[PDB]
Every structure is written in structure tokens, then in C-alpha cells.
Amino acid sequence: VRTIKVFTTVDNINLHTQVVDMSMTYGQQFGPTYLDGADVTKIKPHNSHEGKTFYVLPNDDTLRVEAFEYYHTTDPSFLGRYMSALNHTKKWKYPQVNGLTSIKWADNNSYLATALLTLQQIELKFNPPALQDAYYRARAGEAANFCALILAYCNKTVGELGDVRETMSYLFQHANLDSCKRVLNVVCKTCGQQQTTLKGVEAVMYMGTLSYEQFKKGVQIPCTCGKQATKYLVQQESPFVMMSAPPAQYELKHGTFTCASEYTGNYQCGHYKHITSKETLYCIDGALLTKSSEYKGPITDVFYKENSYTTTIK
Numbered sequence: 001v002r003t004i005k006v007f008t009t010v011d012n013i014n015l016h017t018q019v020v021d022m023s024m025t026y027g028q029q030f031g032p033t034y035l036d037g038a039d040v041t042k043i044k045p046h047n048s049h050e051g052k053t054f055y056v057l058p059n060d061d062t063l064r065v066e067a068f069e070y071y072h073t074t075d076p077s078f079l080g081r082y083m084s085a086l087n088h089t090k091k092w093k094y095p096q097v098n099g100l101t102s103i104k105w106a107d108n109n110s111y112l113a114t115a116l117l118t119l120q121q122i123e124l125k126f127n128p129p130a131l132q133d134a135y136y137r138a139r140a141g142e143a144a145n146f147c148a149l150i151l152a153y154c155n156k157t158v159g160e161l162g163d164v165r166e167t168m169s170y171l172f173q174h175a176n177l178d179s180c181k182r183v184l185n186v187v188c189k190t191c192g193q194q195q196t197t198l199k200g201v202e203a204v205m206y207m208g209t210l211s212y213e214q215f216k217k218g219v220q221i222p223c224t225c226g227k228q229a230t231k232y233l234v235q236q237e238s239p240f241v242m243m244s245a246p247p248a249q250y251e252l253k254h255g256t257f258t259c260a261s262e263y264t265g266n267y268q269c270g271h272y273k274h275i276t277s278k279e280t281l282y283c284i285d286g287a288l289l290t291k292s293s294e295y296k297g298p299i300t301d302v303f304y305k306e307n308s309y310t311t312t313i314k
């Protein structure tokens with residue numbers, strides 16, 4: 001029979017030679033098969049396909065190991081979701097806005113833009129080689145693979161409404177934050193004190209208030225007895241912190257933060273904007289850039305720099 005030589009892969013680094021029957025679909029021979037994101041499972045090999053690399057599902061022990069070592073996941077549908085998203089993100093545009101790689105608007109991708117812009121302003125190293133490799137290229141302007149990966153890891157399809165706080169959570173889970181530590185103390189006038197220690201992702205994220213200073217002074221939270229307890233920051237050790245809260249009018253002053261995310265909309269429909277504090281305040285809305293000395297808007301996430309902090313409260 002007529003045949004061509006193609007290479008299969010799961011990480012696009014380790015190739016596996018294959019002789020394919022041109023009279024059979026790639027699916028009949030390899031299972032679900034993708035070419036640069038396009039699903040060729042039901043397609044038959046072309047002559048132009050000779051020597052090209054195709055993605056396939058891990059169908060043998062060797063591919064299973066290569067897939068995990070690269071992506072750090074054994075979700076059976078991961079590759080399918082990564083390839084489906086890549087077919088869209090590879091068409092997106094990734095301009096350099098104020099020295100940072102952004103994303104031109106498309107398919108409700110605003111949350112990915114501000115997520116990507118935030119990454120380029122905080123110290124963070126990913127663990128999965130897939131994210132390492134893709135993030136390095138996103139920084140250089142080719143973020144199509146990185147975005148497809150963020151969609152795949154976060155179990156989001158192109159066009160789906162996404163949450164920045166949730167998205168950052170997944171990415172931080174795939175990053176080295178083992179050196180991060182946080183100590184809190186909850187004071188209830190009826191139940192006394194109660195210190196708590198957090199590590200890793202839970203050490204750099206808080207949901208309730210946007211102000212890092214107010215976190216140090218104290219924030220009101222419900223106690224089981226019915227009173228309102230006061231939780232404040234005892235000790236922090238991390239290169240950054242993420243403060244989040246439900247969208248609410250909030251003033252971002254120049255020089256008091258690294259960057260933030262604005263959200264306009266509701267739980268079913270909205271748009272994200274990015275605000276970064278450099279020589280002045282810049283608002284990056286995908287490919288759009290505006291500046292101002294003062295900013296006030298519906299802020300939902302604020303990122304601050306950090307190294308080591310210890311409270312003076314006693």
C-alpha cells in the first residue's frame with residue numbers, strides 16, 4: 001500500500017516515527033490525532049503531511065510517561081482540550097503593550113489578557129515543563145500555546161466566561177511557591193485568639209479585601225459564636241501577595257501596588273481590564289492602552305510586592 005512517514009508526539013519534543021497507510025484515517029491508526037491543533041482524526045494522510053509532527057493521545061506506556069512529565073496531568077481529555085483551544089488561540093494577536101505581552105480581544109478572553117499581563121509583573125516559576133516552555137515564548141510574543149494551556153489546565157473552552165482569581169489559582173498551583181508562608185491571628189472578644197499558618201498558594205492569596213494595609217490592621221469576619229472577629233496578618237514571606245474581593249468601587253493610588261484587575265458585569269457576563277502602576281497608572285484592555293494619574297473603578301484583584309513582613313501588633 002502507499003504510505004508516508006510521519007511523527008507522533010505528546011509534548012512536541014520527543015518524536016515517534018510512524019509509517020501510515022494513506023488509505024486509512026489517522027484515527028483508524030493512531031486514535032484521536034491533531035495537526036497544530038486541527039483535528040485530523042477523520043482525515044486521511046496527504047502527501048504534504050510527510051515528515052510532519054502530529055499530536056496523539058497517550059496510548060502506550062512510553063507516551064503516558066512523556067505526557068505526564070511534560071504537563072503534570074493525567075486527565076484523559078487534556079490533550080483534546082489543549083488542541084481544541086490551540087486551534088483558536090493560534091489565530092489570536094499578541095501585541096506588546098508597554099513592554100508586556102497582551103492579547104487582542106476575542107471570545108471573552110479578557111480574563112486571560114489580564115492574567116497574562118499580571119504574570120509578567122510578579123516573580124513566579126512554573127513546574128510543568130509545558131508551562132515553562134510556553135510561558136517563555138509568551139514573554140517573547142508567541143503566547144498562543146501558553147493561552148491554550150491555561151484554558152486546558154483551567155477546564156475552560158474558548159469563549160467561556162472566566163474568573164481571574166480562579167485562573168490565577170490554577171496557575172499558582174502549577175508553580176513553585178513552597179517558600180511562601182503566612183501567619184494569621186483571629187481575635188474574638190468572646191473566644192479569645194486563634195493563630196493560623198498557611199503555606200504555598202494559600203499563603204499568597206486572600207479573598208475579602210483588596211487593601212494589603214487593611215489586612216495588616218485587621219478585617220472583620222464572622223465567628224461561630226455570632227460576634228464579629230478580627231483577622232489580621234501576623235507574618236508574611238513571599239515575593240508577592242494577591243488581594244481579592246467582590247467587585248466594588250475602589251481607588252488605586254500610584255505607587256501603592258504592582259497591578260490590579262477591574263471587572264465590569266455580573267456572575268454570567270462581564271469584561272476584565274488590567275491596571276499597572278509604573279511611572280503612572282496604565283490601563284491595558286487587550287490591545288488598548290490608556291493612562292491617568294488617578295484611578296477609581298470596580299477592582300476585584302490587587303497584587304502587591306513583598307519579601308518578608310512581621311506585625312507590630314501584640
Ligand SMILES: [Zn+2]
Nearest residue numbers: 188191223225
Ligand atoms: Zn466568637
